[PDB]
Design a binder for this molecule. Structure first.
Ligand code: V3L
Length: 507
């Protein structure tokens, strides 16, 4: 029978914290916003905010905070005071939460449906679970939500396109912001015809409450698990959000870098078995995809189980082709089973990972968006091969960091299935990109054992015949020109891997 894994033994791959560089002291710079007191940062203690007291910026370079005094509502009065007054009330029934949220969202009183929240509260939860929800969890969420100005004292810059910039933030700060998103308090993030934020993903959680989909109660469970944890016990770690945008990329056709090591397996998960490795989030260019709406596929799932990722939607503009988002220090709060319609919340997860010197859990996630291919052959066009290579490379490269201090890339079938990607091409693309970035690859095929074998066989062949990135890229070009360009059927008669074997063996 087929084996469970092939290639380099996974324990020989590099992983954090062991492989990590010595971190320099944490400090703010022009490229790094730090919202906590670094001199007061201690293990197991909730970080203190810097500055000591709330400072406001209401402009096109920073998040528009709900607690801003320039956040106004019909005389024009303080919307924050109206938020406070509406949410500092007792909820016994789901309509009470709905009505509270709608007091400072009156324009959406008709357009925001709450059927899934009502159903969740009254049909899915048992009586005692609901009491707990409205007697403990919801008041505790309101509490940290209204402390926003005491917790998030420093303005948060928007990570716009082209910026190479980092925001480091406490998990406690993220909790207060995510509580605010739940209660839908973020201004200028709601309208269809919104201008300033149309290039940003949704942050407010309103669409989690709408419609009759069975996906919603599973999403709400997942999120209330998170809110329960961080209100019962305040998290003490930091998380770093980094936008990375590269203008220059390898000259793929002539790249002389050799292929790196591979571990490929049809069992295991990226988040479970890629511990301490760069974990690829198969993202939407709007990071988190439809996580706060109806989406529940590869683009959303990691944002649910590591819900601190969701906060990135507050300040991360849509990714361009040459961009990615790197998140360090998020915690896994939930386990799940299934996918899409079969997604279900299994149980809470106790993340047991170590922390680095900046008190960030040794978990690194990179969101990179593949293209969607609505015509299958489009992805073999060299220009599209290059686009994916460059996207993956941007996700993997760490300017300034020696390669020996880089963990393996933990990845899988990026943008395949219903998104249109070919698994075997995308595997080879990620292998080539990892080679250029001088990282090893741990590839999870999620049940597909023939694919595990085919990937390994190809990697072994190319490695043994000493084909560098450029030679392999040249074979991709030959495959395009000889089999794809003039192909009048949806797929070509000869496949990619068989073409490569034959071309090398004929040559
Ligand atoms: N994230 C940060 N951003 C900016 N400054 C910071 C940060 N973290 C610490 N500091 C500052 O770096 C200093 C430690 O520097 P050393 O490790 O080299 O010794 C800290 O004192 C911090 O100074 C400021 O925070 C204080 C706020 O106090 P009140 O305004 O409520 O009175 C105040 O002193 C102010 O100047």
């Amino acid at each position: 029978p087929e084996k469970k894994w092939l290639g380099t033994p996974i324990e020989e791959m590099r992983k954090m914290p062991r492989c990590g560089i010595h971190l320099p002291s944490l400090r703010p710079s022009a490229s790094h916003t730090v919202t906590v007191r670094v001199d007061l940062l201690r293990a197991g203690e909730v970080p203190k905010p810097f500055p000591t007291h709330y400072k406001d910026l209401w402009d096109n370079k920073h998040v528009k905070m709900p607690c801003s005094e320039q956040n106004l509502y019909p005389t024009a009065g303080s919307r924050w005071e109206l938020i406070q007054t509406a949410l500092l009330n007792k909820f016994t029934r789901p309509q009470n939460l709905k009505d509270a949220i709608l007091k400072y969202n009156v324009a959406y009183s008709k357009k925001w449906d709450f059927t899934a929240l009502v159903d969740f509260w009254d049909k899915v939860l048992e009586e005692a679970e609901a009491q707990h929800l409205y007697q403990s969890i919801l008041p505790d969420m309101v509490k940290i939500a209204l402390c926003l100005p005491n917790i998030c004292t420093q303005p948060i810059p928007l990570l716009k396109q082209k910026m190479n910039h980092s925001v480091t933030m406490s998990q406690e700060q993220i909790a207060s912001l995510l509580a605010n998103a739940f209660f839908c308090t973020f201004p200028r993030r709601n309208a269809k015809m919104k201008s300033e934020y149309s290039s940003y993903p949704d942050i407010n959680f309103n669409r989690l409450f709408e419609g009759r989909s069975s996906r919603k109660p599973e999403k709400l469970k997942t999120l209330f698990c998170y809110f329960r944890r961080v209100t019962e016990k305040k998290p003490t770690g930091l998380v770093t959000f980094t936008r990375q945008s590269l203008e220059d990329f390898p000259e793929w056709e002539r790249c002389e870098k050799p292929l790196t090591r591979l571990h490929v397996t049809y069992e295991g998960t990226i988040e479970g078995n890629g511990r301490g490795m760069l974990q690829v989030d198969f993202a939407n260019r709007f990071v988190g995809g439809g996580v706060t709406g109806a989406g529940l596929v590869q683009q959303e799932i990691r944002f649910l189980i590591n819900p601190e990722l969701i906060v990135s939607r507050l300040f991360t503009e849509v990714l361009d082709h040459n961009e990615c988002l790197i998140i360090t220090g998020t915690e896994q709060y939930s386990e799940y089973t299934g996918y899409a319609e079969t997604y279900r919340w299994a149980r809470s997860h106790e993340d047991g990972s170590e922390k680095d010197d900046w008190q960030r859990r040794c978990t690194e996630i990179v969101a990179i968006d593949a293209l969607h291919f609505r015509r299958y052959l489009d992805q073999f066009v060299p220009e599209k091969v290059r686009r994916e290579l460059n996207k993956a490379y941007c996700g993997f490269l760490r300017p300034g960091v020696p390669s020996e201090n880089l963990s393996a890339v933990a990845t899988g079938n990026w943008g395949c299935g219903a998104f249109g990607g070919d698994a075997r091409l995308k595997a080879l693309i990620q292998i080539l990109a990892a080679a250029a970035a001088e990282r090893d690859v741990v590839y999870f095929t999620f049940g597909d054992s023939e694919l595990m074998r085919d990937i390994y066989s190809m990697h072994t062949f190319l490695t043994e015949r000493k084909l560098d990135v450029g030679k392999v890229y040249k074979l991709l070009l030959r495959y395009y020109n000889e089999e794809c360009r003039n192909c009048s059927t949806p797929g070509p008669d000869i496949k990619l891997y068989p073409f490569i074997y034959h071309a090398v063996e004929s040559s």
